[PDB]
Design a protein around this ligand. Sequence first.
Ligand SMILES: [K+]
Length: 407
Amino acid sequence: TDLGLGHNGVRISLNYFDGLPDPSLLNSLYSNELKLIFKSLLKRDETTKEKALMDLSNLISDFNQNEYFFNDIFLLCWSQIYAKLIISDYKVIRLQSHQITIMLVKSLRKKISKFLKDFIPLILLGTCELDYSVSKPSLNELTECFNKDPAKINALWAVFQEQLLNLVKEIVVNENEDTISDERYSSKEESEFRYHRVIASAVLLLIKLFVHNKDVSERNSSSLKVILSDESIWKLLNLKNGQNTNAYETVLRLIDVLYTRGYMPSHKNIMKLAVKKLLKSLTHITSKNILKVCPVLPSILNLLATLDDYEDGTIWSYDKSSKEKVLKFLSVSRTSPSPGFFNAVFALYSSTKRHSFLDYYLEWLPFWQKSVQRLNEKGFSARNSAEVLNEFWTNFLKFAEDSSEER
Ligand SMILES: [K+]
């Protein structure tokens, strides 16, 4: 049987309809107080959950009196609902749930070693939550749980890399908008936003896994292929609305790491999947939303310059109208340039000229011309006027020195 995130006989999942504590297992709990606490956590009413978690948290803080209660039956049950609690919209529920688990690890050391495979990956997922109101306190209490040693934390990323990837796979491949949220009690927007948060956390977790493990690609090739071949991660490459750009930038970073490590060159199918979605997202940038998106444009351009190095600009062939997309993307983005922008544009020019992607005089030159025109009319009133203006001229002069052979 597929136990999902579970490694001790019971199924642990993030969805709402399975991986639930068996009614018999619950009745076998030590104290009648626990039975009610758990029955309270299996409901939907989130008000009574905050108290139930508070009560449970109190029983664990007073570990002296209460200890025989926190046995294997408790850990099996808790490990199942813990997974479902950390996807709640109420950040208090997610935070308290993490603290409880962290407290259990810190208190039942050795006695809980068997369950660490189930708890650590979810704790770390909490530290990867883009909301710092949850990810910072979680990481703090976690770091404190291990003698305040950040090296002991970095070890966790290596020890549990298999279970960490399995968690990613569960979020990305197996669950979706309609399994993380019950359509009967949740609107479409609610479901989307909820799933977005969870998968966004998974992408960051996935990135941290490459940071801490130099051989992750080779040691987990089959697991990574399943994760990255799915469409779900790459669907995050969306700048339309309503989400901010945090998740978007995180995927950019993932693509970069994957390319740098030489993973994507090894998996053309996955690279085609990511790039197609990346190129399509360029069309999401308009005058309507340029002011919300402009701080991530240097990242886009730099990534495209990097990818252009693959097989002499082969990535551009993944989209029949990639040239047109880039042109329209450049014309929009020059209206609201930010620091690093012109450095990135030149990076793209310097790389793509090797196969004459865009015309020097009919396409590149007017871009630079209209750019300085924009900078002169508005600035230098705006902030970072001097920095950006100087950045433009430094890069244009380098661009202009190629006008030699292009004549
Ligand atoms: K999915």
